[PDB]
């Protein structure tokens, strides 16, 4: 039984990062790490179905 | 040994985040994910050594 609240919070962080490409551009890895966490979360929620 | 380039880039990102508390504070999880990746990287580099 999975909870969407975490995923929802992450995607709001992601929307925000997308809105600030100038800030994102001064970090080496920051936005990629958020993307990877989001992919991980979605995979987990789906796999707790199988 | 060296050069541990990925770790240095991450730790630079972390210092930059610390330097920008107002920017960091508008996100729910962003800085923690960075902290977690750093710990993971240091752990892997150390474990690769016990081989
Ligand atoms: Ca922190």
A8 touches chain B (CB under 8 A): no
Angle B1-B6-B12 from CA coordinates, rounded to 5°: 115
- CATH fold of B1-51: 1.20.5
B33 touches chain A (CB under 8 A): yes
- Give B20 Cα–ligand 1 centroid separation in angstroms: 11
CA distance A30 to A17: 9
- Resolution of the determined structure in angstroms stands at 2.1
- CATH fold of A1-50: 1.20.5
CA distance B47 to B23: 34
The full set of domain ranges for chain B reads 1-51
Burial of B34 (0-12, 13-18, 19+ CB in 10 A): buried
Integer angstrom CA distances of residue B36 from B1, B11, B33, B43: 22, 11, 5, 11
Q: What was the experiment behind these coordinates?
A: X-ray
B3 vs chain A: nearest CA distance in angstroms? 17
- Which residues have their alpha-adjacent CB atom under 5 A from ion ligand 1? B 31
């Amino acid at each position: 039984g999975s909870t969407p609240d975490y995923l929802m919070q992450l995607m709001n962080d992601k929307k925000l990062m997308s809105s600030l490409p100038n800030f994102s551009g001064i970090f080496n890895h920051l936005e990629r790490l958020l993307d990877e966490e989001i992919s991980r979360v979605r995979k987990d929620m789906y796999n707790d179905t199988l």
